[PDB]
């Protein structure tokens, strides 16, 4: 019989496939939710039993900061995102730079009292630090035009194929805690089947941390001084921890988000595995690049399995990496607890944060919490304080001033009107996803 | 046991590997076939049971434009391709810019009376438009010179690991519709079974289809005009369609080569799925580059399950795309139709052109067809026609034209006499690689 | 029910994870082993039954060559490879250009008399003529930093994700050949079971082959001259032997270092595949750039399955390749032979090394031998002698020179001293490592 | 009343144009001449007063080394160098890699006993170590192909704007010392004047010279170690001499190539200017890029008056630079030695050549001489003896070998009769460069 990673193209099953989308459901070009600031919106819920086989989204966030000569009603049926270079003085929509921390992911599977992955929106996707990088692995790809690529909250695609089995439901959703709308575009795919899935099923989860600042013992200390290598650390009490987690199941892998501060090497230290609530940790790496499969220092490269999304050497001081542990998951019977030291023996106090990836059969035995959203923001330095004072002014440039005011007062209002109807279409088209997913269920059930 | 997508390397299989080749069977050094002008050619038949496992091709396709002070009868036996600038003087084996389209791949299973497989031979590795773009990809790879890229007929590296199993038998077939012979060189392995495939296995078929130019409403309006964008399109009845089969099976995705006309944005349309007669879609996509998981147009990214293999921004006007649905496959159980809109609500009258790859079981319902070679050609602009008239030509010019057009008349004919030596060779291999496939079928099964 | 390749990450296993590391046992930041010159060193041994998941390591090997200003003492215990330039005049640890050779990886399973594994370590993790290039695969990958690539023995991560099980022991050695010491990361992954693995279980192999030179016919002739194309060779009896193995198992592919002495193409020789004893090849393939899935040559392209490591074009004359047959292994029921003719019918006489990698049941019929250090050396071009004879010297000159001699005869010794300590926690960890998988292996079969 | 570089371009000068060039005097499509073997070769001689303005070069120099399948009497006649690749099987004409320091460019002015230009060809126009690299400069430019760089001996364009006065005679010569002919296209511009040139007019001077190995103290010692930076150089008596030049003029630079030994750094030597005889020099530099205007190191930039032509970065250890004194110009009214300490203190032992340029008046006091051909090639690593024996040949291969060895027989002199009649089309074509020299000499002064 067949063998190899494509064997399963060569049988047919008896499954049916669905999909939860942002599809202009007027049937016209707007196939983009609208996610209102400060709000839950429902993606879908999906009758099990199912798997999610594939997720594809996008997103813009711009801020309205200058009146336009565009006509704002008229515009707002035109491209979705005005890429529009703000010297050429017609319009200035700028982008929101931290809107990927402040959107997280929510996903809950079978009714339980926990959602199971809750993520903020980027670093689920494997964007950190809300600044993207151009990417492919096997289960996460990101791909960010270079025209849009070293900045915060920069447009891209993202894209997952981690398998999400679920017996009995899925709600996925996206929780805005912005203070602004944004635009979400997506496609999540799935199948239904025709009987339950067996019960040691494991379900995906996904979590995320932020120590920041990590309490490092020698924050001041030069990293590799003899000083700092001679200190010991056997039982990571004090390590970073991406995940501690009490059931059945194994872990898949992270992302890691590292804003360094002393400016040499934050990678020292050594991931330690504690599988089943032993005291020492039974899995002991060497070193944190080495944990992502790099060696002195990170490379810029991103392989199947492990690698950097974003390079240090690219931006002031913060690196993205990742692995996943695919074909090598650490599996765990009653608990795991995944750790990082902080620099050798936790000397360093930098801003780490972290999405673990796991699988276990349910329940999910512990609530997914998260930092609220005045935690998740990028440290990015800030200009001093510019208090400017106009010069005296002539006649001619009051005039100027005031009648820019004036376009301000009538233009602003205008948009937000458009804003709130999009919104408002996103809050129907929530509704009609799950309606259409249960027809679908409920048609082939009948079937 | 042994987990993960490298597990079945951990057990043996009583399976016996053969392959069909382009291998000189006189033991010298032309390992490729002479594929005659206007002709068929079988590259092999294998009785089944058994599986194509992998299929490695590259090709070449010179036209003799000029005499040659190399020795035509010597240089049969030198390199296959005179890979040398005209600016020397001394040959000149012009490039045939469209024999990736004026040749098919064609495939027939278990003696059935269509064929499951018929695509422009380049189409089929993913090469769009007879113009190739170097590209990795799970299932298919292209590797492509620097030195040859950007232009029409590059040779380059063609490799498939889609497997294709069939229960009784396997033909391959190349059908030259060109005018001129061209070199293939192939590698098409497999494995052969000691027992049947189950009768429900899934076998490898793909279909090649073009709407050129698309049948638009609004060729001329700008795209994404408030006008266009504001007009419906639900049941999809005018979509693009790459795909329109009866049977039991899964779609595992496509290639699509785009010639865009307007010099705005060719990639609004939705794809939209029609799952087993249902009238209006089920899936419903957002957008022709979020089919492809891009965003905001294709960006230069080729990861293994999608995206660029040619970017409109290296080309006058063309993209080729791909999209392969190996983990998330779009099931069926009587009929699939895979749509996309040709802009938004098939607004635009581009020329476009796919291939569709699925696994159905047997028997193939749907007939599968191919445009004829006339509407398989890329559209290019053509330079004015030049009437030169010959100055008033000195008795030395004339001398020259008269001496290069006599080695003219005696190099063509001598260049001929070359290609039918090969061609003879090509049909007589052909013979000898299906006699060798049915003894090592018979010597296998005879235990 | 769960398809394609992430399905096992849905269904718990009841399996312990372990890792054999160079972790540092004193829990300070030495998390690397420094490997004794001319001897063996057991990364660990683990009891069966179980799997090796996954490998990572990195290395360094440098010479001291001249006195430094830094407190050897001190040193130690700071960052592990002083990448400080010569031209700073404070130190100078040179790299030893052929470590990579000179230390093998070998591999013992189920307490056979032979090594399933026998492979100097940078040809195993797919590091060809001790000549790091940065690739990715889907089984090997190479992280080579662009500041030390192009050089021979620059450091560099490899990773392996070949599945290896064993029922009841597996034992992972370095074998150092060297006369100098080198540093050593590892990780090391694998799961334990609770049950035996089946009997038809296939254990993971690999062997190292050089023919330097190839014993060529026709070294001093043309490449692609007539004469050379129209030689036959049907039988390969002189072709380049990749593998030759009894036994019942499958080929998974291959790496290939070439150095090119006539400055031509060393690439047509056609791959022949000899299976289960047969006098000629059933598998005939068509040249070796066409085995490796390219064509016209070698490009600058690494894809999952086959592809370019070190490219001819970067280098003084050679080439580092691979094949992995992962979907399309190369099955054998008694026994196989891979050979690759070098040049067209063996006409070339260059200098070819392989690794090759298969799976078979045990026992291991075929005792795997490794040719002696003196015959794994790359092949480099040597500057003349260049016997110099001191100006007369002034009185300052003889003293800069003696003050210099009497620091270096100081300094040597010292760091001697640092290195003979480092070796001591190697043979201490070497052991721990053992008494820990051994410790854990019983308390989860006590479990 | 005009000012600035241009002014000259506002005035007119009753001056007439001459051109000596390598133009086929036969009217065809020859333009080079075929400079023979261990030859002098007159390109043009041209009676005072006059000015040289530009000169344009490029050169090539191929071997035969294998039969080819172009008939090689029309090959003669085709483009002048055959630019196909050996591995094609149909031609090979390898490339001679130091024909650049084998031929020398010789200039005498006003019928002198000594030439006052007496250089390498290829170091003249800035090619150092026989091996070009891509740079401007405002004098000199070297137009290099990328297809063609990274080798010894690469074809490319040289240009040359220093002007060369001479009030009574020019004569320029190719010596070619080299045992094979060379391809020379050449353009060499001046214009002659109706009145003599002022007799303090200064004239064009170049030579060359090298210290192979310089005779350093502490080659062994590392590079700015302590012990080396505090030894004391205050007169350079052992500094390397890049001009030693009695009379009065001024120095207006060099081209300087370094072949570095130690891989340390070469450059720490400070220029050191000895003007009218002085003990001690009154010009004391800091270091040798910082001669070059460079800084810590060599960098990959060639600007108007300095800088890199080829960067040890990018070679196996040697390092091209130049340096322009234009408008900074080191002047002398009775003697100049222009020195370099060959590392800190003459250190280094190292591979120094240079081109030293300057103008004088009349009379060149000594001889300018060259080292004999033997003591210009450039230091390169030789493969180790490849002792190769043929195998036991088939009948078969035999017949091949002897096939081959009879075509070689007959090509090699069909090849060496084209050389014979291209070096008589040269000799002839320089006795009638200076024919019409002379006649426009005349013409200009009778009108
Ligand atoms: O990769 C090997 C080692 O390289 C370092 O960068 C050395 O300073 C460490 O973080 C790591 O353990
Ligand atoms: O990727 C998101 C959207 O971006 C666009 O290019 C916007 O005009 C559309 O085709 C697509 O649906
Ligand atoms: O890739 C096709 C063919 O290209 C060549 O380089 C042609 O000389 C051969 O090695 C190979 O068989
Ligand atoms: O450019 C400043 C200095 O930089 C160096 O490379 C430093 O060692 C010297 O050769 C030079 O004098
Ligand atoms: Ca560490
Ligand atoms: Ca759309
Ligand atoms: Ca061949
Ligand atoms: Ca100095």
Same mark, same amino acid.
């Given at each position: 019989e067949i063998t190899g990673l494509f064997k399963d193209l060569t049988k047919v099953k008896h499954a049916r496939n669905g999909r939860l989308a942002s599809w202009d459901q007027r049937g016209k070009n707007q196939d983009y939710w609208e996610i209102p600031a400060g709000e839950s919106i429902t993606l879908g819920e999906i009758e099990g039993p199912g798997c999610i086989t594939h997720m594809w989204m996008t997103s813009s966030c711009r801020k309205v900061v200058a009146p336009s000569i565009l006509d704002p009603e008229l515009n707002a049926?035109?491209? %979705?995102?005005?890429?529009?270079?703000?010297?050429?003085?017609?319009?200035?929509?700028?982008?929101?730079?931290?809107?990927?921390?402040?959107?997280?992911?929510?996903?809950?599977?079978?009714?339980?009292?926990?959602?199971?992955?809750?993520? /903020?929106?980027?670093?689920?996707?494997?964007?950190? !630090?809300?600044?993207?990088? #151009?990417?492919?692995?096997?289960?996460?790809?990101?791909?960010?035009? %270079?025209?849009?690529?070293?900045?915060?909250?920069?447009?891209?695609?993202?894209?997952?194929?981690? %398998?999400?089995?679920?017996?009995?439901?899925?709600?996925?959703?996206?929780?805005?805690? !912005?203070?602004? %709308?944004?635009?979400?575009?997506?496609?999540?795919?799935?199948?239904?089947?025709?009987?339950?899935? /067996?019960?040691?099923?494991?379900?995906?989860?996904?979590?995320?941390?932020?120590? #920041?600042?990590?309490?490092?013992?020698?924050?001041?200390?030069?990293? !590799?001084?003899?000083?700092?290598?001679?200190?010991?650390?056997?039982?990571?009490?004090?390590?970073?921890?991406?995940?501690?987690?009490?059931?059945?199941?194994?872990?898949?892998?992270? !992302?890691?988000?590292?804003?360094?501060?002393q400016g040499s090497w934050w990678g020292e230290g050594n991931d330690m595995f504690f599988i089943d609530g032993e005291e020492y940790p039974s899995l002991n790496g060497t070193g944190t690049e080495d944990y992502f499969n790099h060696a002195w220092g990170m490379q810029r490269n991103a392989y199947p399995f492990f690698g950097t999304i974003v390079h240090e050497g690219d931006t002031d001081g913060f690196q993205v990496s990742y692995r996943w542990h695919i074909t090598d998951p650490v599996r765990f019977e009653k608990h795991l607890k995944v750790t990082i030291e902080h620099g050798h023996a936790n000397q360093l106090s930098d801003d780490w944060s972290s999405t673990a990836y796991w699988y276990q059969i349910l329940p999910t035995a512990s609530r997914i919490t998260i930092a609220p959203v005045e935690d998740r923001l990028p440290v990015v330095p800030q200009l001093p304080e510019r208090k400017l004072v106009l010069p005296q002014l002539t006649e001619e440039q009051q005039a100027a001033r005031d009648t820019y005011q004036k376009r301000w007062k009538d233009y602003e209002p205008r948009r937000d009107t458009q804003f709130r109807i999009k919104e408002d279409k996103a809050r129907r088209e929530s509704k009609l996803n799950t309606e259409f997913a249960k027809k679908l269920r409920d048609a082939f059930d009948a079937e």
């Open positions: 049926s035109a491209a %979705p995102v005005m890429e529009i270079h703000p010297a050429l003085g017609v319009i200035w929509d700028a982008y929101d730079p931290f809107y990927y921390r402040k959107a997280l992911i929510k996903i809950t599977w079978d009714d339980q009292d926990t959602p199971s992955v809750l993520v /903020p929106f980027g670093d689920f996707f494997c964007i950190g !630090n809300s600044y993207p990088g #151009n990417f492919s692995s096997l289960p996460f790809n990101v791909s960010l035009k %270079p025209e849009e690529a070293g900045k915060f909250g920069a447009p891209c695609s993202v894209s997952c194929y981690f %398998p999400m089995p679920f017996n009995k439901k899925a709600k996925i959703e996206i929780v805005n805690d !912005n203070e602004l %709308p944004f635009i979400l575009y997506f496609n999540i795919d799935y199948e239904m089947y025709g009987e339950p899935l /067996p019960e040691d099923t494991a379900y995906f989860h996904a979590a995320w941390h932020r120590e #920041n600042p990590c309490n490092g013992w020698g924050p001041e200390l030069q990293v !590799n001084s003899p000083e700092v290598n001679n200190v010991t650390n056997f039982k990571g009490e004090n390590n970073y921890t991406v995940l501690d987690v009490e059931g059945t199941g194994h872990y898949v892998g992270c !992302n890691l988000t590292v804003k360094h501060f």
